[PDB]
Design a binder for these strands. Structure first.
Length: 1236
RNA sequence: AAUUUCUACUCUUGUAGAUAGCAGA
DNA sequence: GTAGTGTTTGTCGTC
DNA sequence: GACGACAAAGCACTAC
């Protein structure tokens, strides 16, 4: 079992796309008969007919909901018990109780409820059966419930084309489904409206009991409107009335008892909604509500737990402070011996409960109220200052786009503020406050969709990719390529001079083949026979005439209808097909074994099949002699696995050029050249993968032995043109490049446009200082030939979609792919490992490690195909965001990252095959990535991992030959088929996923990590404790380095809870000597880039810091003797100076900071604070090639080491299974012990 | 700035990589 | 008239 | 225990 043998494991289906160029006079014939216009109306009716069809669903669903009568007492008790006890047993009890009620509603739809009689119950089943297929159009379902002529004309527009509603059928199943999905009617009744109605009944009785006069007052409101005349006010707040609140008309009446495409379109609609906010005075109402909070009872104003951490980060130092302050005050009011169990109960309570505003203020201090007041007025003033600010006239200028976004940010800011308060009725909400808040919260609700609509309008491309499929009045066009079904599908293919053509017969063309010597096209003859397990009984035994004759009368028969010679069927072989489980099937093997009867039945069936294939019309000559004798086959399985591949075949027969060309002239054939930019006249270079798929499908070897099957169900399309502002490079102008002379640094976007206007003599202004300096370095080109910016959408285009099945000879689905991969990895201990980590100074960095741990190659992936993506392109695009912060610039970056990740896919698969390695990514469930990194978190990288699995699902390298494995005919199968993001584990074929955290902040030489969390210590007293835990600090005179001994069994409150190996450490203040690297460049050893500037501004600017030089400067000023090598900590503690004790902790902060990054001066290195067994401190500035070169190298190096940990456990464990993740402590113990 | 179309691009009337379509979020 | 044009079934695999 | 995968067997109804 070699690595190179991971081919032909399971089938992979892909769909190709091509542009059909009308050849000859086929364009005139199409327009003359108007297929395109008729098809345009049909897609443009797919919108007129949809509301008409919905009348059937709406009426039938409404009618079924009118008879629903249920007892909701059980559902209420399950809701109460879950709110009472928050245990997993009461949750599962509620989930089952909800599923029971959803099915009770579902049984009204399908007709399986005991509440209705059989006559009514069965009538619904006859409707629900044909409710999601072509029976909607019969009028039959509407006959159970009258069409107009225009509606009838709209129904017939989809004659032989109702598959256009394929996805729509699924959307309507989501409406009537009984599953726990929010698109469904049962879910809306059971899990959405009833908890609201159940809460309404509780709010009602509490008010009536406290204020009984409110009862007659509520009754007067109901009588004064006229709703629910036959129902009193107490009954509408009782459970039985909810059965009459299941239809929209009743829901509307219930709610009324409670309540009583273009540029100017975004301006007219927003200003209309904007001017509506003034008339409702929602700002004045909101400003009055937040002003009430200064005097009203704050123990009944609740903050949502889903927003508490967000509020903490917006009003306090960190997200932690609020949850922690509430934790300390609640522990402060526990009873008796406060165990660690009681503390964990307080922790879990704070995760899922709403906190009242008073408990927050009493726990956080008066400085939260000032933060709450300041943030509230800040948001309210911005929304108030935006409602009176008028919108611009157009969105032509970016300055006019900015003010539209600025006002939407103020509107979304107020909308964000209102969602701070808990909405659920589980809390004791204020009467007036909850009503006034919910009113303005729902009146600010449309502002969220207005933010998203406007952004998509500005970030959309100037094209119009919308398109409608072409049917040519044939419902089953391109459904199948077979010659027998050629007539009824009207789709064929050709080939001539290496150019592939598609032929369509519009509303017989008896093509007469000619010899190969005659010039012309080569028609593809497609012969297919789906499966012998189903075709042969259908065509031989289960014929209607044959079955009826044998059931009644017992004599045999010679079948001479559609057969080259009569075939024969005896009485017994029909009984073998239909016994009194089938005998030739594995019936005896499953139960009641009989070997003698089995083989006789098996051999009779197989010999029948061979005779039938010889006598059937089109299978009479398809290589039937290659079958191996019948009597010794084990079962039908290995026969059909051998018979089905032979049935599929493709042949090419020459057809005269005159016949095809004249056929197009007379209008009986619609030629269409398949064109995908790889058949152009100027094409010189390696082609697209899909072209190789298409070229390899018709290669002589593929027809000889099938590996890529040409599936049916192909589709055609037509894309109307959409040109708004055609811009092109006409002759006589100058085409400026987007890269400099070195061909790797892109020009900034704003500067390139200015230079393009200047070099072309169109800029009326003067080049800026930076623009002028860039002029001598840019290259210009004359317009040799005319170029159109996005020529694709300038004119109408046809499109052809065709599916292919790669690895057709393999199984349908993979069978234990991970087990096979693990088995190979077990027997090949020398396999290398590939790790990928997103760096801060570069997008992607990769390191490959051998079996025993040494690095074979560390590379930066920010320069792909002679183009720098991170250092220049993403950085200047990032610079644009800081300058503008508009919507369009945000869209460009997201598109660019996806384009970058496409390039990275090629390098991973290329490097993998060269090393035959397993690539270890980082799983996204665990950890979080810093904002300074180029690639976003879990947004674009999560899609990138899926694209890697899909690429390796069927991997082809376009340089590899077709015959050799790794090519188009025999693609690699290196990963299992993708199922879901959540379903995938730590291993998917040759891809391993490891936890991201603790991979960069680690010394590669020692495995050391910063053992202290710096968030814990703020106070002077904690600084005394922190520096007391350390054993001793002394100045080694011989080496000139301070040594700080630390023991992991101390300062447990300041650690992070991850001891690891190495019970004792020696943190050293290495001397600031001018060391030299491999290249000879000088640097100062021990240099640290620390960002500590202010208490609130700890990141604004970076400063050079030298721990050795600042420590000796501090000790000298304090007059603390250190040349003798004596302990320094006892002297500092007994000296008792606040400044020295404070500064020393910051120095310990600095030394422990391995990550040193400075964007301006271009340093990114890791300097270790501890020495390894050799007695040398790691410093990546030395550029040692056997250790990580840069900081981003360390992250990729340790991610690959984490994958090595999983692979090592694979080898040591007897079973072929992997641990479901690895703990942080285990990883720390592994790396620290390994380096010892 | 020309692409089945997506990104980036222009010695090269195109280059390099990706690309499972269809309907609905 | 009469066949040329223009929905249903076969065991599977998959669940 | 119902849903795809395909053709080819199965019924209408009329152009010829």
């Amino acid at each position: 079992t070699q690595f190179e043998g991971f081919t032909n494991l399971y089938q992979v289906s892909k769909t190709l796309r091509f542009e059909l160029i009308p050849q000859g006079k086929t364009l005139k014939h199409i327009q003359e008969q108007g297929f395109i216009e008729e098809d345009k109306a049909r897609n443009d009716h797919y919108k007129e007919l949809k509301p008409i069809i919905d009348r059937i669903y709406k009426t039938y669903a409404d009618q079924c909901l009118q008879l629903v009568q249920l007892d909701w007492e059980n559902l209420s008790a399950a809701i109460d018990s879950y709110r009472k006890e928050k245990t997993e047993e009461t949750r599962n009890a509620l989930i089952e109780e909800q599923a029971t009620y959803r099915n009770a509603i579902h049984d009204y739809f399908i007709g399986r409820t005991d509440n209705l009689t059989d006559a009514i119950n069965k009538r619904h089943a006859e409707i629900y059966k044909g409710l999601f297929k072509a029976e909607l159009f019969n009028g039959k379902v509407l006959k159970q419930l009258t069409t107009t002529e225009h509606e009838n004309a709209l129904l017939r527009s989809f004659d032989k084309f109702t598959t256009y509603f394929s996805g729509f059928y699924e959307n309507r199943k989501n409406v009537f489904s009984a599953e726990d999905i929010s698109t469904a009617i049962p879910h809306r009744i059971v899990q959405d409206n009833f908890p609201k109605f159940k809460e309404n009944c509780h709010i009602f009785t509490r008010l009536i009991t406290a204020v009984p006069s409110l009862r007659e007052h509520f009754e007067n409101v109901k009588k004064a409107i006229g709703i629910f005349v036959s129902t009193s006010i107490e009954e509408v707040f009782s459970f039985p009335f909810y059965n009459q609140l299941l239809t929209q008309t009743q829901i509307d009446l219930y709610n009324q008892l409670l309540g009583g495409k273009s540029d100017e379109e975004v301006i007219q609609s927003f200003c209309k909604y904007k001017t509506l906010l003034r008339n409702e005075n929602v700002l004045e109402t909101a400003e009055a509500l937040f002003n009430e909070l200064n005097s009203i009872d704050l123990t009944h104003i609740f903050i949502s737990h889903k927003k508490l951490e967000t509020i903490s980060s917006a009003l306090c130092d960190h997200w932690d402070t609020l949850r922690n302050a509430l934790y300390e005050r609640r522990i402060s009011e526990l009873t008796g011996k406060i165990t660690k169990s009681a503390k964990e109960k307080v922790q879990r309570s704070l995760k899922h409960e709403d906190i009242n505003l008073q408990e927050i203020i009493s726990a956080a201090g008066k400085e939260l109220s000032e933060a709450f007041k300041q943030k509230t007025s800040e948001i309210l003033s911005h929304a108030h200052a935006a409602l009176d600010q008028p919108l611009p006239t157009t969105l032509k200028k970016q300055e006019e786009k900015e003010i539209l976004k600025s006002q939407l940010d103020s509107l979304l800011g107020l909308y964000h503020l209102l969602d701070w308060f808990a909405v659920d009725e589980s809390n004791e909400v204020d009467p007036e406050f909850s009503a006034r808040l919910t009113g303005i919260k729902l009146e600010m609700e449309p502002s969220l969709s207005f933010y998203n609509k406007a952004r998509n309008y500005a970030t959309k491309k100037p094209y119009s990719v919308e398109k409608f499929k072409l049917n040519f009045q044939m419902p089953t066009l391109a459904s199948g390529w077979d010659v027998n079904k050629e007539k009824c599908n009207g789709a064929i293919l050709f080939v001539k001079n290496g150019l592939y053509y598609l032929g369509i017969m519009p509303k017989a063309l008896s093509f007469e083949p000619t010899e190969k010597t005659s010039e012309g096209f080569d028609k593809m003859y497609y012969d297919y026979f789906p499966d012998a397990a189903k075709m042969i009984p259908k065509c031989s035994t289960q014929l209607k005439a044959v079955t009826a004759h044998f059931q009644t009368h017992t004599t045999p028969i010679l079948l001479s209808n559609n057969f080259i010679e009569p075939l024969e069927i005896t009485k017994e072989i029909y009984d073998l097909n239909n016994p009194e489980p089938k005998k030739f099937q594995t019936a005896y093997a499953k139960k009641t074994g009989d070997q003698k009867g089995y083989r006789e039945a098996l051999c009779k069936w197989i010999d029948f099949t061979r005779d039938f294939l010889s006598k059937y019309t089109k299978t009479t000559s398809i290589d039937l002699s290659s079958l191996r004798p019948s009597s010794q086959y084990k079962d039908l399985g290995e026969y059909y696995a051998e018979l089905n591949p032979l049935l599929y075949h493709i042949s090419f027969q020459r057809i005269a050029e005159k016949e095809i060309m004249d056929a197009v002239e007379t209008g009986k054939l619609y030629l269409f050249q398949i064109y995908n930019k790889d058949f152009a006249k100027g094409h010189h270079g390696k082609p697209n993968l899909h072209t190789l798929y298409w070229t390899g499908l018709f290669s002589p070897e593929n027809l000889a032995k099938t590996s890529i099957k040409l599936n049916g169900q192909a589709e055609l399309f037509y894309r109307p043109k959409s040109r708004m502002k055609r811009m092109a490079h006409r002759l006589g102008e100058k085409m400026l490049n987007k890269k400099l002379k070195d061909q790797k640094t892109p020009i900034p976007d704003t500067l390139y446009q200015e230079l393009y206007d200047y070099v072309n003599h169109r800029l009326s202004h003067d080049l800026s200082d930076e623009a002028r300096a860039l002029l001598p370095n840019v290259i210009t080109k004359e317009v040799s030939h005319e170029i159109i910016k996005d020529r694709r959408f300038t004119s109408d285009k046809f499109f052809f979609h065709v599916p292919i099945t790669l690895n057709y000879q393999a199984a349908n689905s993979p069978s234990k792919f991970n087990q096979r991969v693990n088995a190979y990895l077990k027997e090949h201990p020398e396999t290398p490992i590939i790790g990928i980590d997103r760096g801060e100074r570069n997008l992607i960095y990769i390191t490959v490690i051998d079996s025993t741990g040494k690095i074979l190659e560390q590379r930066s992936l920010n320069t792909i195909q002679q183009f720098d993506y991170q250092k220049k392109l993403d950085n200047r695009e990032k610079e644009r965001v800081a300058a503008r912060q508009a919507w369009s610039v945000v869209g460009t970056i997201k598109d660019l990252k996806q384009g970058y990740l496409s390039q990275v896919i090629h390098e991973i698969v290329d490097l993998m095959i060269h090393y035959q390695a397993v690539v270890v990514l980082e799983n996204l469930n665990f950890g979080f990535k810093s904002k300074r990194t180029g690639i976003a978190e879990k947004a674009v990288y999560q899609q990138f991992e899926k694209m890697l699995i899909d690429k390796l699902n069927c991997l082809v390298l376009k340089d590899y030959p077709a015959e050799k494995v790794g090519g188009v005919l025999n693609p690699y199968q290196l990963t299992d088929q993708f199922t879901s993001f959540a379903k995938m584990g730590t291993q998917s074929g040759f891809l391993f996923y490891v936890p991201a955290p603790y991979t960069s902040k680690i010394d590669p030489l020692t495995g050391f990590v910063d053992p202290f969390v710096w968030k814990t210590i703020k106070n002077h007293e904690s600084r005394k404790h922190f520096l007391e835990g350390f054993d001793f600090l002394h100045y080694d005179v011989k080496t000139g380095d301070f040594i700080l001994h630390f023991k992991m069994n101390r300062n447990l409150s300041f650690q992070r809870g991850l001891p690891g190996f190495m019970p004792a450490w020696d943190i050293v203040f290495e001397k600031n000597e001018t060391q030299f690297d491999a290249k000879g460049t000088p640097f100062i050893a021990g240099k640290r880039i620390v960002p500590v500037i202010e208490n609130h501004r700890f990141t604004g600017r970076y400063r050079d810091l030298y721990p050795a030089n600042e420590l000796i400067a501090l000790l000298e000023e304090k007059g603390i003797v250190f040349r003798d090598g004596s302990n320094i900590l006892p002297k500092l503690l007994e000296n008792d100076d606040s400044h020295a004790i404070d500064t020393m902790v910051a120095l310990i902060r600095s030394v422990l900071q391995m990550r040193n990054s400075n964007a301006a001066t271009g340093e990114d290195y890791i300097n270790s604070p501890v020495r390894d067994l050799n007695g040398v401190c790691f410093d990546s500035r030395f550029q040692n090639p056997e250790w990580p070169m840069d900081a981003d190298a360390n992250g990729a190096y340790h991610i690959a080491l984490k994958g090595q940990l999983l692979l090592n456990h694979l080898k040591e464990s007897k079973d072929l299974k992997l641990q479901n993740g690895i703990s942080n402590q285990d990883w720390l113990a592994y790396i620290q012990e390994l380096r010892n």
